[PDB]
Amino acid sequence: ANTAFVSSACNTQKIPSGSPFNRNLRAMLADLRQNTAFSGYDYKTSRAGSGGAPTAYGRATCKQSISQSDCTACLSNLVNRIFSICNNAIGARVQLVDCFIQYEQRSF
């Protein structure tokens, strides 16, 4: 998939070192990545926090014109960069040419 970078908006506030929100966030993001191409190329999900971490609320979309396998390839690629693109923010939007991930500690 075209993985080239297009746009981002980041949260000015970052996830604390060792914070438990890292785990539910990434269980969350794992669902997006696994399930998006098979749930309409645009799909939302959420994971509750443990140990005082807020719920993680997520969204992922994919360019309707790419294959399902190609779509999970773009999302995996994006999950790999989104943490760099926004410096461990507690919230982020990142758009790649063929796919998009949003995540927040609040439903959106």
The C-alpha atoms of residue 14 and residue 16 are separated, in whole angstroms, by: 6
> Where are the domains positioned within the chain?
1-108
CA distances from 18 to 14, 22, 97 (A): 12, 8, 32
In this structure, are residues 79 and 28 in contact, taking their beta carbons and an 8 Å threshold? Answer: no
User: What is the experimental method?
Assistant: X-ray
Rg (CA), the chain: 13
**Among 10, 9, 3, 105, residue whose Cα is nearest residue 58:** 105
Tokens of 34: 């696994």
Task: Give 36: exposed, middle or buried? Use CB within 10 Å, 0-12, 13-18, 19+.
Answer: buried
The C-alpha atoms of residue 52 and residue 60 are separated, in whole angstroms, by: 25
The C-alpha atoms of residue 9 and residue 73 are separated, in whole angstroms, by: 22
In this structure, are residues 10 and 86 in contact, taking their beta carbons and an 8 Å threshold? Answer: yes
The C-alpha atoms of residue 17 and residue 31 are separated, in whole angstroms, by: 23
**Among 89, 106, 93, residue whose Cα is nearest residue 16:** 89
* 93 assigned ligand-binding residue: yes
Bridge partners of 62, per DSSP, are 99
* 104 assigned ligand-binding residue: yes
* 11 assigned ligand-binding residue: yes
The C-alpha atoms of residue 64 and residue 20 are separated, in whole angstroms, by: 34
Pick the CATH number of 1-108 from 3.40.50.2000, 3.30.430.20, 3.90.550.10, 3.30.70.920: 3.30.430.20
